[PDB]
Amino acid sequence: SLSPSARRVQGALETRGFGHLKVVELPASTRTAKEAAQAVGAEVGQIVKSLVYGGEKGAYLFLVSGKNRLDLGKATRLVGGPLLEADKWAVAALTGFDAGGVPPVGHNTPLPAYLDEDLLGYPEVWAAGGTPRALFRATPKELLALTGAQVADLKEG
Secondary structure, three states: OOOHHHHHHHHHHHHHOOOOOOOOEEEOOOOHHHHHHHOOOOOOOOOOOEEEEEEEEEEEEEEEEOOOOOHHHHHHHHHHOOOOEHHHHHHHHHHOHHHHHHOOOOOOOOEEEEEHHHHOOOOOOEEEOOOOOOOEEEHHHHHHHHHOEEEEOOEEE
């Protein structure tokens, strides 16, 4: 049985029009992105991290490649100003879920979003579904249509 938080995410996919996609439960010890990757037999680069940063007029969601690291220099240029990495506590609210488990949809407070163009380098990806131990699969395209993010260059070199 999936958790309450995993249940919402799943319901959100269905009301938005992506009911064929599904949330799967992973081992209770699954804490990082590589353990998550091992579990579905995916490369660590296919995992999607939902990073929350706070700007002057609101929060922004950054969906980054598991093998990459967000370049704050680029992050600021896209937004159009300075950003503040959301504190793990602040994440609790702007979202309502756990840090290390933040879902790219099913939110209570919709945020603008950017998506690591390196994710389109794969046929399918795995985004978090509620907790560090939940994930759901989708093609780069579907995640783009689900979230409505702007594909962008975000990685450090």
